């Protein structure tokens, strides 16, 4: 009982901020949508203007252009009632579809609005859902920019712009308040038959907002001059309406039927459903009228009628009343006044107005994966960034030498190319130049072959930009901790390289001195990018780009529109420039691009050029849910980019600034950032006066506008500086040496000090002091606001007259699970492809170990994890275990020691190790057995729970309270007992074939062969589970406890036949034969105590059993039949691996061996484990180099297994009693990954949340030797001459 | 994000329940087969005479999946399992993977 009203107001309303807030909408396909088209049917309708209208309207891109001069009041009426009703369309459009609204209905809502809001209200009056809605609201929008022109064409042919306009639309319209409009329209009469005026041009009452107020409506000229003649006390206000409305007297049908000439005819129109209230009409309700006919009566109020605006609550609450209601609940949208509808409204009504509920939160979550914005538009996170930047070979040695304030220019070292005869003072020969100086790198010759699979003699033909591209990109990869085919993002199909270069100077001049085999490939800049797709197997794209001295932004760019459009999942962004032809800067300084003195002098009042820097810098990025998923350090991110040309220029070269201020506003306008959120500008100064000025004051307009009154709108200070003046100029990676600036302060908080300025300021530069933007000459404090972001502006500009600027922010906040990682022991791995390499990173880690010794207690599980899963593992290989740091550090001090002493490391064998699964039998079984696996592991607890559901669907006992309560053992039934071993064994088996084991063969030792054979995959889980508890339902059912025993002699068979009184068979019998001088007989209790007996008088050892039924003895003779029956209910298979059996004592490799009749024999008959393991010896299956693994409660199995096999064969058990269990798992891994193994390191983190983080670990220890091409006999200098 | 979790549960105690041919080489096994001509309660006469007759796993039997139509049904197995079993259903017995 409680009504809704849709209220749309008119051009009185500002809607630049409703503009703002739509345009900035990002988590709606519909909003989206409707904003993408309806500039398009904008654009289309102002084409279709007169002449004259057509010179009054700007050129607009987007929205994003019309919201400037809709606020600085030089926008034209047709523009400004459009841009009005596209505010209103949108913004009920996003509350409606976005804000989850139920749309108005017939029964419980009603719409209106007021001369321009009346199109608005038959858009929705017609529709039913925002899909119906959106075609419907292009319609409308270019109705009402046909309506603004009509009105516009009129007003322009009754009066003329004044001479004092200036661009402003003089408002034809003022609000009158004092006096009641019966009052006023008898002022304005007399006025009219004073002033003798013609019938056109006369004042009128265009609106009667109240009983004391109105609005009224004239020309310019005559509005002011009939406004002059009102008197106190009665107040004139002047209202932002540029046009005549609602006037009969200048507007006839012909001028509506123009407006809604725009509609095709059809008889498919909707009609209008959701009642209008039309307040200014005769009649107030509106309903059933089709969508142009409603259209056209719209119009007709807009231009003919008087706004009866003192009427439209009395009619919105006469429609309350007619249907019962009791109370009205106002939706405005871009409505003016509207805080005063509600209680206007229920002023009328008997009462009942009620507050409204809350939001209900955010009204369900969303699915995972579907709570991001669509990739279009997006944050770039950057996840890590490498380079070699002058006297450095790291980012740290670039912070080192930025935030001391270092001039690391210097003239040509000996190795690129002479001095005394390639510069002069005066230049007077040929391709002499006439400066000297730059920013080298001293180690570009130095790679590492064989690393990357190059030999001795194409490394010397490989451009160091090719070379220093491939070491950068390893580095920056292994930093962001990305494997290949790792996660979905980093498959090696979606990643792409792109790059940015502007010389091969290696061609030119070092290589083309002896053309060869890797002339071109060495030399080519597509090669570039071709070498980092090619090692790392990325088959994405790869692309090489060239423009000028922006070609690293550039590139940038490109990677971003990509990572935009679903190309790649991945970027590697990188950027280099390497000088070693003459002739280039020879050739920039006879440009006179190149300061004769020293490095570049940004914001000095003597500068005079710049200075080129070598530098190398590559990057890697991805979309902020792709790295936040796949858990990856995320240093920055890229809010975004833009470029565009110095066309205006004067020249080719010299840049031109108004283009720079509208790259910068666009790139803030697609951000969404005002000028205070902006902190930093690495401004691009190169050095040039007329440079550095331009820029700065594009820079300071852009970020730090000047109030009309002199002051400075900044709130808080802007900081602007030039990494070039450190460095100098690379031409290349200028943009990508910025970006590293950028992210080394954002990493260390620091603002570093400015070395340009040498002598004063730039007396050319605006006031910056005034402006409050300051050049930082000593290093300044930069903190991350609490709860905030810092935000950084960059620019990069080019000799040929493009333009690249980008906005960051700071990466979102860390939110590291915090939690503790229960286990005790931790690996620590790490590999190499040299053994020099290994002796590199065992010292960096000892030294990175020394510098982290006392953090806290979960760097050691993180160094772990970012050693195991987030690393690649090379030939060469090294490991340690412990359960602190400390005992890691000596365990790798101590393989250093070895490893310097002379012991050599030698590549693990190609193919790896193989693998033998002993499984053992029921004598071992202790209380609480996996109890430690089955809470620490998901997957083990997933199949235990499997295991029993099916266990209880065939009628047999639980097992999971045998892994939770761990006091169930003590009563635990020989089938509970059994069941529970053979489901253990199971899911042990298959955790570890999880963590990558795959058995070479299998072997069982009498209960051991059922989960062999599920190894083997004779048979399934729930055949397997079948099988035993029918077994043990058998011997529970038919045998008794207590008549028969077992005992076990450590004697060879013969010496135990001698000894023995009666012959094998009847007075015993051989159970089990394990070994040469180990066996296991069985017998009722007076032969086991008569045989016990005549032993020990023989001085030899025995020992008793504790089984209660008897195995591989007579007693299982009256069961036989029965199991054989249901040993044909299994589905027996052939098996992928041989199963070495013992009851046979063979090896089978074949089904037909696994009939019934083997799961009698095996019941009934004895353990030939020497011979199965002999003849498995035979056939080669096993050997010395083979590794056992045991399966089950206790390494029993795998000590008859080293007996039989030899003496130095390695074995290993799964668990223990005495033992920890992560102690003997971490002991078996290491083993494994030493021998050569390919662990699945990232399921073994997968159910430890607290070690999933990447650290900055040391880098790999480049064998780093020089491959260089020297420049010599100074033949640059003769490039025409003769041998003369 | 259901029908995904749904399916994975029915393969995970699919797969438990039986091993992949070695002869599949890529391709994924019927669980169902339509069989048309028998009522439903014939067809379930039938299986329960099949289950007696035969030794199997309580959790290994053939079941009436789906009723359809009065003549038409679908059983679901293991694949060797439904296969042993289809192959005792004679004419004008119809049978559809």
């Given at each position: 009982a409680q009504m809704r009203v849709v209220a749309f107001g008119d051009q009185t309303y500002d809607c630049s901020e409703a503009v703002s807030q739509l345009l900035r909408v990002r988590d709606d396909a519909i909003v989206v949508d409707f904003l993408e088209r309806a500039p398009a049917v904008l654009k289309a309708e102002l084409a279709r203007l007169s002449s004259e209208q057509q010179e009054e309207t700007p050129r607009f891109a987007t929205l994003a252009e019309l919201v400037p001069r809709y606020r600085a009041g030089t926008l034209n009426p047709a523009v400004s009632q459009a841009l009005t009703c596209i505010a209103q369309?949108?913004?009920?459009?996003?509350?409606?579809?976005?804000?989850?609204?139920?749309?108005?209905?017939?029964?419980?809502?009603?719409?209106?609005?007021?001369?321009?809001?009346?199109?608005?209200?038959?858009?929705?009056?017609?529709?039913?859902?925002?899909?119906?809605?959106?075609?419907?609201?292009l319609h409308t929008v270019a109705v009402a920019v046909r309506l603004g022109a009509r009105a516009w064409e009129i007003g322009s042919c009754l009066a003329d712009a004044r001479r004092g306009a200036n661009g402003r639309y003089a408002s034809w319209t003022s609000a009158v308040g004092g006096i009641s409009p019966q009052d006023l329209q008898d002022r304005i009469s007399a006025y009219t038959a004073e002033q003798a005026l013609a019938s056109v041009s006369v004042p009128y009452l265009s609106?009667?907002?109240?009983?004391?107020?109105?609005?009224?409506?004239?020309?310019?000229?005559?509005?002011?001059?009939?406004?002059?003649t009102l008197l106190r006390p009665l107040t004139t206000t002047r209202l932002p309406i540029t046009a005549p409305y609602h006037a009969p007297h200048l507007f006839t049908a012909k001028d509506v039927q123009h407006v809604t000439d725009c509609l095709p005819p059809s008889e498919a129109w909707p009609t209008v459903r959701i009642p209008i209230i039309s307040f200014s009409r005769d009649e107030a309700v509106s309903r059933g009228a089709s969508f142009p006919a409603a259209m056209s009566e719209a119009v007709r109020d807009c231009l003919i009628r008087p706004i009866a605006l003192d009427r439209m609550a009395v009619s919105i609450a006469n429609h309350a009343r007619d249907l019962g209601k009791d109370s009205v609940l106002p939706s405005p949208i871009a409505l003016s006044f509207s805080d005063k509808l509600g209680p206007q409204v229920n002023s009328h009504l008997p009462g009942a107005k009620a507050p409204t509920p809350?939001?209900?939160?955010?009204?369900?979550?969303?699915?995972?994966?579907?709570?991001?914005?669509?990739?279009?538009?997006?944050?770039?996170?950057?996840?890590?960034?490498?380079?070699?930047?002058?006297?450095?070979?790291?980012?740290?040695?670039?912070?080192?030498?930025?935030?001391?304030g270092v001039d690391t220019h210097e003239l040509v070292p000996p190795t690129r190319w002479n001095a005394a005869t390639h510069v002069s003072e005066d230049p007077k020969a040929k391709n002499v130049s006439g400066t000297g100086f730059g920013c080298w790198l001293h180690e570009a010759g130095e790679f590492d072959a064989a690393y990357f699979n190059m030999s001795p003699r194409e490394a010397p033909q490989v451009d160091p930009a090719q070379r220093l591209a491939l070491l950068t990109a390893t580095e920056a990869l292994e930093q962001a901790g990305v494997v290949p085919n790792r996660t979905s993002s980093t498959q090696k199909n979606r990643v792409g390289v792109w790059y940015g270069a502007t010389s091969n100077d290696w061609m030119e001049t070092n290589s083309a001195q002896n053309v060869d085999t890797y002339f071109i490939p060495g030399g080519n800049r597509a090669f570039i990018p071709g070498r980092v797709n090619y090692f790392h197997k990325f088959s994405g794209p790869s692309y090489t780009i060239d423009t000028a001295?922006?070609?690293?932004?550039?590139?940038?760019?490109?990677?971003?529109?990509?990572?935009?459009?679903?190309?790649?999942?991945?970027?590697?962004?990188?950027?280099?420039?390497?000088?070693?032809?003459?002739?280039?800067?020879?050739?920039?300084?006879?440009?006179?691009?190149?300061?004769?003195?020293?490095?570049?002098?940004?914001?000095?009042?003597?500068?005079?050029?710049?200075?080129?820097?070598?530098?190398?810098?590559?990057?890697?990025?991805?979309?902020?849910?792709?790295?936040?998923?796949?858990?990856?350090?995320?240093?920055?991110?890229?809010?975004?980019?833009?470029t565009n040309h110095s066309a205006e220029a004067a020249s080719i070269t010299r840049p031109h600034a108004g283009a720079q201020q509208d790259l910068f506003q666009q790139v803030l306008t697609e951000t969404g950032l005002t000028a205070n959120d902006i902190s930093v500008c690495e401004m691009h100064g190169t050095g040039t006066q007329a440079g550095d000025s331009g820029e700065t004051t594009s820079v300071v307009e852009t970020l730090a506008p000047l109030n009309r009154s002199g002051s400075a709108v900044r709130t808080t200070p802007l900081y602007i500086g030039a990494v070039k003046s450190n460095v100098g100029h690379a031409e290349s990676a200028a943009g990508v040496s910025s970006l590293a600036k950028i992210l080394l302060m954002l990493k260390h908080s620091k603002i570093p000090p400015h070395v340009g300025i040498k002598t004063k300021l730039n007396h050319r530069l605006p006031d910056l002091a005034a402006r409050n933007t300051h050049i930082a000459r000593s290093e300044v404090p930069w903190p991350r606001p609490k709860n905030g972001k810092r935000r950084v502006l960059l620019n990069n500009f080019s000799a040929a007259g493009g333009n690249t600027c980008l906005v960051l922010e700071d990466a979102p906040e860390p939110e590291d699970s915090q939690e503790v990682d229960p286990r005790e022991h931790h690996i620590v791995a790490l590999s190499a492809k040299t053994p020099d390499s290994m002796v590199n990173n065992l010292t960096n880690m000892i030294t990175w170990i020394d510098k982290h010794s006392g953090d806290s207690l979960a760097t050691?599980?993180?160094?772990?994890?970012?050693?195991?899963?987030r690393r690649?593992?090379?030939?060469?290989?090294?490991?340690?275990?412990?359960?602190?740091?400390?005992?890691?550090?000596?365990?790798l001090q101590e393989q250093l020691d070895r490893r310097v002493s002379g012991e050599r490391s030698i590549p693990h064998p190609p193919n790896g190790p193989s693998f033998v699964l002993a499984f053992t039998g029921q004598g071992s079984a202790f209380a609480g057995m996996g109890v430690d696996l089955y809470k620490r592991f998901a997957s083990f607890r997933s199949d235990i729970a499997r295991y029993d559901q099916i266990c209880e669907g065939m009628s047999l006992p639980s097992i999971k309270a045998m892994f939770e309560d761990e006091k169930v053992f003590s009563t635990a039934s020989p089938t509970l007992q059994q069941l529970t071993h053979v489901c253990f064994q199971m899911a042990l088996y298959r955790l570890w074939k999880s963590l990558g084991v795959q058995a070479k063969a299998v072997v069982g030792h009498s209960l051991g062969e059922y989960a062999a054979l599920y190894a083997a995959g004779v048979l399934s889980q729930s055949d397997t589970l079948y099988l035993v508890g029918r077994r043990a339902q058998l011997m529970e059912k038919h045998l008794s406890q207590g008549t028969h025993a077992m005992l076990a002699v450590r004697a060879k068979e013969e010496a135990i036949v001698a000894a023995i009184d009666g012959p094998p068979g009847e007075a015993y019998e051989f159970s089990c034969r394990n070994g040469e001088q180990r066996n296991v007989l069985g017998g009722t209790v007076a032969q086991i105590q008569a045989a016990k007996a005549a032993l020990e008088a023989k001085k030899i050892r025995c020992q008793y059993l504790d089984t209660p039924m008897a195995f591989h003895t007579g007693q299982v003779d009256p069961i036989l039949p029965e199991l054989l029956q249901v040993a044909a209910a299994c589905s027996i298979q052939d098996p992928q691996i041989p199963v070495i059996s013992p009851a046979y004592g063979k090896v089978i490799r074949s089904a037909k061996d696994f009939q019934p009749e083997y799961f009698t024999h095996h019941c009934r008959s004895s353990v030939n484990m020497v011979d199965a393991l002999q003849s498995a010896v035979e056939e080669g299956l096993l050997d010395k180099n083979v590794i056992g693994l045991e399966i089950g409660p206790g390494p029993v199995v795998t000590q008859f297994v080293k007996e039989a096999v030899g003496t130095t064969m390695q074995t290993f058990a799964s668990i223990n009693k005495d033992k920890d269990t992560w102690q003997l798992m971490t002991q078996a891994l290491a083993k494994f990954y030493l021998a050569g193994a390919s662990v699945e390191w990232s399921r073994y983190h997968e159910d430890f949340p607290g070690a999933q983080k990447v650290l900055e670990l040391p880098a790999y220890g480049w064998a780093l030797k020089n491959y260089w091409l020297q420049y010599v006999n100074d033949w640059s200098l003769r490039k025409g001459d003769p041998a003369v």
């Open positions: 369309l949108g913004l009920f459009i996003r509350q409606h579809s976005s804000g989850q609204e139920a749309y108005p209905t017939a029964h419980d809502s009603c719409i209106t609005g007021v001369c321009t809001g009346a199109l608005t209200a038959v858009a929705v009056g017609s529709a039913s859902s925002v899909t119906a809605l959106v075609p419907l609201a609106a009667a907002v109240g009983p004391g107020q109105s609005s009224v409506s004239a020309a310019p000229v005559i509005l002011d001059a009939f406004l002059s809350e939001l209900t939160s955010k009204s369900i979550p969303s699915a995972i994966g579907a709570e991001q914005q669509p990739m279009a538009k997006s944050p770039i996170a950057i996840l890590a960034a490498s380079g070699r930047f002058p006297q450095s070979s790291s980012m740290d040695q670039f912070w080192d030498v930025l935030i001391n001295c922006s070609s690293s932004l550039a590139a940038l760019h490109m990677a971003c529109n990509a990572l935009w459009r679903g190309e790649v999942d991945t970027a590697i962004v990188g950027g280099t420039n390497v000088l070693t032809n003459p002739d280039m800067t020879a050739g920039l300084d006879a440009g006179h691009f190149l300061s004769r003195s020293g490095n570049c002098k940004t914001f000095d009042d003597e500068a005079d050029g710049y200075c080129r820097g070598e530098a190398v810098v590559t990057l890697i990025l991805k979309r902020l849910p792709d790295a936040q998923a796949d858990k990856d350090p995320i240093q920055a991110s890229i809010l975004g980019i833009a050691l599980p993180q160094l772990s994890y970012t050693t195991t899963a690649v593992h090379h030939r060469h290989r090294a490991v340690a275990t412990g359960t602190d740091l400390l005992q890691i550090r000596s365990s």
